[PDB]
From Swiss-Prot, chains A, B:
Belongs to the protein-tyrosine phosphatase family. Receptor class 1/6 subfamily. The first PTPase domain interacts with SKAP1. It comes from the Eukaryota. It is found in: Cell membrane; Membrane raft; Synapse. The lineage of its organism: Eukaryota, Metazoa, Chordata, Craniata, Vertebrata. The gene is Ptprc. Protein tyrosine-protein phosphatase required for T-cell activation through the antigen receptor. Acts as a positive regulator of T-cell coactivation upon binding to DPP4. The first PTPase domain has enzymatic activity, while the second one seems to affect the substrate specificity of the first one. Upon T-cell activation, recruits and dephosphorylates SKAP1 and FYN. Dephosphorylates LYN, and thereby modulates LYN activity. Glycans are attached at residues 15, 18, 108, 139. This is Receptor-type tyrosine-protein phosphatase C.
Amino acid sequence: DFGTPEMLPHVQCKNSTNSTTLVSWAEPASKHHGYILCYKKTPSEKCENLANDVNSFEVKNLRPYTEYTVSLFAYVIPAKDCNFRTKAARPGKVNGMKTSRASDNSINVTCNSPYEINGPEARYILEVKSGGSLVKTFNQSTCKFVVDNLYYSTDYEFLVYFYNGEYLGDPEIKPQST
Amino acid sequence: DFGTPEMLPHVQCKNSTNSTTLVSWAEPASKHHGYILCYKKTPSEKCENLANDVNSFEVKNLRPYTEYTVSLFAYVIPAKDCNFRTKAARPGKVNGMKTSRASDNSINVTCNSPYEINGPEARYILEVKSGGSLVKTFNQSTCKFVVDNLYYSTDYEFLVYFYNGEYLGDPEIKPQST
Ligand SMILES: *[C@@H]1O[C@H](CO)[C@@H](O)[C@H](O)[C@H]1NC(C)=O
Ligand SMILES: *[C@@H]1O[C@H](CO)[C@@H](O)[C@H](O)[C@H]1NC(C)=O
Ligand SMILES: *[C@@H]1O[C@H](CO)[C@@H](O)[C@H](O)[C@H]1NC(C)=O
Ligand SMILES: *[C@@H]1O[C@H](CO)[C@@H](O)[C@H](O)[C@H]1NC(C)=O
Ligand SMILES: *[C@@H]1O[C@H](CO)[C@@H](O)[C@H](O)[C@H]1NC(C)=O
Ligand SMILES: *[C@@H]1O[C@H](CO)[C@@H](O)[C@H](O)[C@H]1NC(C)=O
């Protein structure tokens, strides 16, 4: 109906930066208005000629946990797009793992996300070991752990794994004494 | 016309793996056929409510050298999609840089692509230094360099930079003697 959320014509957005753009549109004199800005990555179609007279094809080299759309075209020598999602895989290792003394018997552990997530979620698992024995374990949304109440002159190992909702990746291991 | 490249109905593609899928379609008894399989990443629209009665908006936190599409919706409190591309940025550092002796006065240098490309191309720049002086330079598509005819008992530094068609990133530096 008139005044309900409708798409706006003549929108400008080309004045971009490496990480931003300025989106601008016509100024209505008329009344008071609310707005919804919508955006997505423009994906480019990748086409290939298969072998003649084949019934199936294995599409390879796809990224894990990614939504894709396929279409087939035939020629002699309404059709809907087919949607699928690749299965999840093991994520990569965390980046920039830093182990630091917070106090006399306290250690602070920080890291940044892996580049390859490969799944629906993002969690950080920290294992704390001494002489190969599990001393403490933590599971968080943010890779900022405060590990306190440890023994005074002890060698500890800190193992941070990324969890993507389906898989645990390899740990980034860092030694740190008290 | 009849027999020219037309989109095929009833295509199946859901039996995926972490990096592949099986795409299958109806077997025509009729004649001999050629095929084009087309695919792309299905991008998800990200919508947000802006402030009321505004004329412009700065879309931030975008990836460098990425194509995007924007649309605006107004409501009281044919319109085309607007396409743009973020500008290029400095790529990241190369991964897994390995320096090895190929012979007595020969060194082999290998690395893998950075995670962040941020531009249209992919090239590897290798600088070879001795006592801070530039000895050799190479520019290649593949990060596999064979550095021969060096002096016999000399310390050299190998600096590999990634070039993305617009920017050079930071070097990965590795010492290697002959
Ligand atoms: C992808 O799946 C195969 C089959 O299970 C597995 O061997 C491979 O490790 C997987 N990749 C990752 C990164 O999980
Ligand atoms: C340890 O991290 C906490 C935040 O999680 C912070 O308040 C504290 O100052 C940090 N200590 C050191 C030594 O960085
Ligand atoms: C970490 O916690 C989440 C809940 O917040 C849970 O679903 C997940 O299973 C835990 N991590 C691992 C590695 O299982
Ligand atoms: C993005 O652009 C700004 C402005 O020139 C610059 O300071 C910043 O370093 C750029 N980022 C990269 C990774 O090139
Ligand atoms: C050096 O690399 C070349 C390929 O570029 C290969 O033929 C040669 O065997 C390599 N040598 C060593 C020591 O790996
Ligand atoms: C490397 O070579 C390409 C041509 O193949 C050239 O366009 C580019 O300028 C060179 N690299 C750098 C860092 O300029």
